[PDB]
Amino acid sequence: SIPETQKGVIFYESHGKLEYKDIPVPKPKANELLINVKYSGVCHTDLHAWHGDWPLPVKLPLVGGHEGAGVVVGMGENVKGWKIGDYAGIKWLNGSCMACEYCELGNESNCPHADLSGYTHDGSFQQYATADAVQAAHIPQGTDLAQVAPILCAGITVYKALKSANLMAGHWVAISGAAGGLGSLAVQYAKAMGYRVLGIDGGEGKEELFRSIGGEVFIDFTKEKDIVGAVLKATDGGAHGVINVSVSEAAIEASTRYVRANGTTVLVGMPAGAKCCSDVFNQVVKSISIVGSYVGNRADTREALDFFARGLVKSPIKVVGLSTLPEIYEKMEKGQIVGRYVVDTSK
Amino acid sequence: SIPETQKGVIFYESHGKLEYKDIPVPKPKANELLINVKYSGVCHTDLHAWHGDWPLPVKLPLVGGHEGAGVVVGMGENVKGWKIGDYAGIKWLNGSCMACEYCELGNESNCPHADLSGYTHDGSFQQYATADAVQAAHIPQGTDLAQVAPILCAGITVYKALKSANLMAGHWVAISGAAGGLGSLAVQYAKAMGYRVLGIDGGEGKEELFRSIGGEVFIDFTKEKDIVGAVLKATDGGAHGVINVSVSEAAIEASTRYVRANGTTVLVGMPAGAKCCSDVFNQVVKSISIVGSYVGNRADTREALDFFARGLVKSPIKVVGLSTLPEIYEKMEKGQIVGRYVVDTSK
Amino acid sequence: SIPETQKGVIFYESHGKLEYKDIPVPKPKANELLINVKYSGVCHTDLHAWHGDWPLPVKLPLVGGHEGAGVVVGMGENVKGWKIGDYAGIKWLNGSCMACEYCELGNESNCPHADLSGYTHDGSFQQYATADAVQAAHIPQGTDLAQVAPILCAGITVYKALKSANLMAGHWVAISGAAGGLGSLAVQYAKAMGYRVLGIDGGEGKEELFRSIGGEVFIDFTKEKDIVGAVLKATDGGAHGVINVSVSEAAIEASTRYVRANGTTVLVGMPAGAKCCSDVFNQVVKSISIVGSYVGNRADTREALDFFARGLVKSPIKVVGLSTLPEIYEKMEKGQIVGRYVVDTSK
Amino acid sequence: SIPETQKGVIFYESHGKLEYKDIPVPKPKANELLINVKYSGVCHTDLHAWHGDWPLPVKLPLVGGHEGAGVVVGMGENVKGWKIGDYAGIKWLNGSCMACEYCELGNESNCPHADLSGYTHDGSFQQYATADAVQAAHIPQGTDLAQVAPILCAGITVYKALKSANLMAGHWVAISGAAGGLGSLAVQYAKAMGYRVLGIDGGEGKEELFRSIGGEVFIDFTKEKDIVGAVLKATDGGAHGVINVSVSEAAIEASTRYVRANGTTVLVGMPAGAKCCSDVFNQVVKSISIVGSYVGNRADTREALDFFARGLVKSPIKVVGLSTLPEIYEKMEKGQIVGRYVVDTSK
């Protein structure tokens, strides 16, 4: 019934060959779900873990991926709150000691023993994966496993970020990078949560797309020469919260100048070796807050997933084969980052 | 090394004999600590579980107790954040599904599958007990295991309660029942947390004891005929928060009338079949809040335990033998509830 | 310029005969505005005042009303941020000391010196009345004064209570009396603020109205044997918040038992001599919260009016004569108002 | 009655010559008090004003000072809650519009119409000055005006920042420049509010002073090679909060890296043209918060003065002549002030 062999996209070296091939089916432990993965999300994070850019050592031979949507096929004796057949979601955060200051506060991310899918643990580019029964998303029955896989990283994240911005219904939120993978989700979660949405992005088509998902006010950065000035103009003081999901330092630092007084600019985008250098006078005189926001926790997960379940949030995906993958890892270099890729494991 | 037999205080019937006798050493599971219990707290809750007053069915044959302080002697393969020798604490809340709305928010108490020490699971009146590795308190090395056992229920609880009152340093807090088991801990946690402490209790000696642990203002309920009036007088508006830890309905309802406007009265004491009947006009006109507060969670635990570790909180205990116990269960009826009892398991 | 005699509805002794008749125009004090009142909402508070339903005495003879919208025709020597001609709003809280701890913190309505329109200060049921300038709603030019009127007590009250319930977009809120004046506006503020809306009401066209305004789940109190269990089942475990905007004791009572674990019932409705009786055991084990909420502050007001301007809230009104007041009270006290009545002061 | 000429310290052009000399007594406006100023603290802000260190221009010629304590000798026609003879306190925020969204919410100091003592309005470095009545600290009778003076900017500022750091009793707070004017008072407000206090400073008798006032852990910046790692080790993983009350860029910088995970660095200190440069990767992965805090509001003020009255805070002062001001600025800008200087206006 459960096979011993399966297909996966492994690699035997830091920045080396990307062999799609037959590998073992991993056994699960007493705390783990055996998940038959149907679709795996794909984003730039999986390109970095491959290279060895981040300095934490990598678990070679390693199956990347951290956005797996699938089905509970087996489980360790001690697993709880899980039936066979349940739909299960594998996130960046695979596991945690569950016995430290941080793990107790739902800040399992900052756990010194953070187990990470597609990095220290074998991720979601394979037909069968193990996961911690606790951290695994509980996907409700009747949800397109393809469509949801993007929610499992970018969606949780942008939702958590949005709570962290610390807003009320009726407040303005600026999404800096609002036609991007993260931006366009941010825009929908923002709208569903009661907020007024202004947006910043550039060039061909990105404005019509923004409107078509409920954005109110667009600031074309290519045409508009004084971004701050318009943002202030448009919000009659400056945006109450701000989400930074561009890949541009300039645009982050701009954020400290268009955010409102008593307001909160939030860091999600982590451009390579970037630094946010805010003027101290401005920041004190206006009691401005600058908050970083990492992945989410079990609660954030459940919530983020309910808006999707309510149909209030959707990702414009496009599905390709799991054997295809090296091309995608290749295209991510070449520049053809463009829309949300998801991988079928049957192919 | 680890024995197969040990002593424990069991019972084979709802409200029956209380045989101190040799019983098995339980095996632990993969998620559990084997704890060699050195001292167990004792309170009225353990008297109720015995009778069958609470309507949830009881796990006969059952070893009561929910305040165990001891030592990690073994552990299941999958346990994490636990070394052998570590000091471990067994609480009312033994375990939880760790996969529901509530378990994800640190409200494991309200879990439908709440596993409870000294009720559905075998508690802390025995030399060796099993516990969930996750929920178990991590007691720091160099803490009197005798002295701490009271912290594991009344202390966590009164601390959690105090946060729930939702106060600032410099605000007044009223402890209603401030020379009692819970009251006198409440008084110390209150002081350590920055609050100004007023107190209410009655009769022989209870005022000198109150002062001797840092209480500012005492209202003798036996002498003072208009409690509300004095409390208002003394706080120049009414106490900002209030803790109810008396065993008296009258005194709870009094609380809704001496609590300040915008303030918060908190329910901890659960007198048998009692009801809090607040005047609706008063409560609206003054935006008063009435909050129930159950046991604490892993975080509350760690925090509560740090003040003890800092020596800022102490319980006037008195140690007796584990064989003694039926007498104590007997004395709790007879009326000789009087000071904090703790049980040595070597006796 | 400004006339001397005017039309008002006045009552000379408690529960007296409502007299529609020529009366003095009032003189503004130095901090006060005179306001030509054009329309005013009719609130159940006003009925409770006419009936003598609350402990506080009225100021006889009394002109009730505190949902009054009008223009500035005059003002006192000391008034700051207002021109003659502006639109102004007269609410429950006429004014306050803006100088004690409560007023400092925003809780202006809990000022022990609070002056109340339509109870201790002749309110808005007349063509000319006065209001303190610092607490008076600034209403944007080109606002329909007949339509805006009910935001000034119904709308801000319920908006503030909703913030007081500690909800999150996605959560369930139960609205007890969801087709009343406050209820109907609660439903819209709740929809707009990202919550899922359940409501309880009864009588002709109530459900019909609830559905038209954005209501998800209706429970007719006329048909449903088990209110409590129906809310439980609908919410799948209890409503995260509840807003009591009935005029009923048994409603209030039940909201203590259909609230969710870690949920919050907000008291708002003030039936005569009514009391909230909550089982202590239950409130404590579930850590349920019970909170009274009292109108809104300047900020709440600002915010509540902005939702209106955006077209997201809309009190269902019928505009009749000020001389028609007795028919409104007659028909209010029989359940039969469906939303709100406002009075044209010229008729 | 009230004199015409008085003694003041005045400067005519930026960074000019400080002139101690006979000058007009000022006339109160209708909402303003005249205050006989007896003593005033000397704050580094005043130095930054004299030097022209910030973007905002001064109001030349300027009498600095905004820690001024005095009695009411007169007031305007429109003043409400004050008698002649009362004690009054003149702070940074002279007054504000008490009528925009910011002022409505408590954030009075972020009013775009804010009037500033000792920058845009002749402050407290003279025997007579004026202040808006609604924002002026009410100081209890029998308060030592020389001693209370520094609460009026140092003390409330640091107390408000501490609330802005989101601490809990038990948590660690690092105070950067803990032996300065603000630092020394921060240390006491922190002790009183239940926090464990670490501080960083340097120069003669600084450590000595830090220990006398309740400091737990000192780090001399003069001796310690590794500031960052020393804070990390002391806190066992980072300070839960940090308060930047230095006048240094490199201090600020380091507070971004010795803050705890999910911790909060509060910006307060305003070195000229200074900037806060935080590594985005780090801020995000740890979800660190960076927050500016700007003086205090009426409520903060009230609260901060109450700590004083209870004897739990005490600025270490030395009282010299108002004509001595240049020696204070001379010695402030060399690190050498140990706590605070206040000026006797009569000398």
Ligand SMILES: NC(=O)c1ccc[n+]([C@@H]2O[C@H](COP(=O)([O-])OP(=O)(O)OC[C@H]3O[C@@H](n4cnc5c(N)ncnc54)[C@H](O)[C@@H]3O)[C@@H](O)[C@H]2O)c1
């Ligand atoms: N915080 C976390 O936990 C977390 C998790 C995963 C990924 N990420 C990060 O998310 C980031 C963004 O990913 P993405 O796929 O959304 O990017 P993307 O390339 O799909 O979109 C980026 C968008 O930013 C826009 N942009 C460029 N310059 C701009 C400017 N000056 N102002 C406004 N917009 C501008 C682009 O036009 C584009 O629409 C990455 O840096 C990645 O590291 C963060």
Ligand SMILES: NC(=O)c1ccc[n+]([C@@H]2O[C@H](COP(=O)([O-])OP(=O)(O)OC[C@H]3O[C@@H](n4cnc5c(N)ncnc54)[C@H](O)[C@@H]3O)[C@@H](O)[C@H]2O)c1
């Ligand atoms: N919320 C929870 O999670 C939780 C957990 C465990 C126990 N409890 C409860 O704690 C309660 C108290 O236990 P205890 O051992 O502290 O009681 P105790 O008998 O030791 O002390 C009660 C005190 O209340 C005083 N008292 C009596 N009438 C009073 C009045 N009118 N005003 C003020 N004080 C008055 C007594 O004089 C006494 O000092 C019990 O009802 C128990 O069920 C609650």
Ligand SMILES: NC(=O)c1ccc[n+]([C@@H]2O[C@H](COP(=O)([O-])OP(=O)(O)OC[C@H]3O[C@@H](n4cnc5c(N)ncnc54)[C@H](O)[C@@H]3O)[C@@H](O)[C@H]2O)c1
């Ligand atoms: N706390 C505050 O700040 C505040 C502010 C304004 C009004 N109020 C009070 O709120 C109450 C409601 O005011 P209104 O003017 O909206 O009243 P209203 O009479 O216009 O509407 C009351 C609604 O309650 C409903 N109701 C009756 N029995 C019920 C039951 N068993 N369950 C559920 N609903 C039931 C009615 O059908 C009706 O639609 C009054 O007591 C009023 O004084 C309080």
Ligand SMILES: NC(=O)c1ccc[n+]([C@@H]2O[C@H](COP(=O)([O-])OP(=O)(O)OC[C@H]3O[C@@H](n4cnc5c(N)ncnc54)[C@H](O)[C@@H]3O)[C@@H](O)[C@H]2O)c1
């Ligand atoms: N944000 C606000 O609301 C607010 C309010 C008042 C003052 N301030 C500002 O705060 C700053 C401090 O004010 P003050 O009057 O207390 O200053 P002060 O000069 O009296 O004290 C400054 C302290 O910083 C210390 N210091 C110097 N180098 C340091 C280093 N590398 N690390 C740590 N500490 C160091 C000094 O030794 C000194 O004790 C000023 O810039 C002032 O303008 C801000």
Ligand SMILES: [Zn+2]
């Ligand atoms: Zn991803």
Ligand SMILES: [Zn+2]
């Ligand atoms: Zn951990």
Ligand SMILES: [Zn+2]
């Ligand atoms: Zn107990």
Ligand SMILES: [Zn+2]
């Ligand atoms: Zn659970």
Ligand SMILES: [Zn+2]
């Ligand atoms: Zn007041």
Ligand SMILES: [Zn+2]
């Ligand atoms: Zn009303």
Ligand SMILES: [Zn+2]
């Ligand atoms: Zn203002």
Ligand SMILES: [Zn+2]
């Ligand atoms: Zn200052």
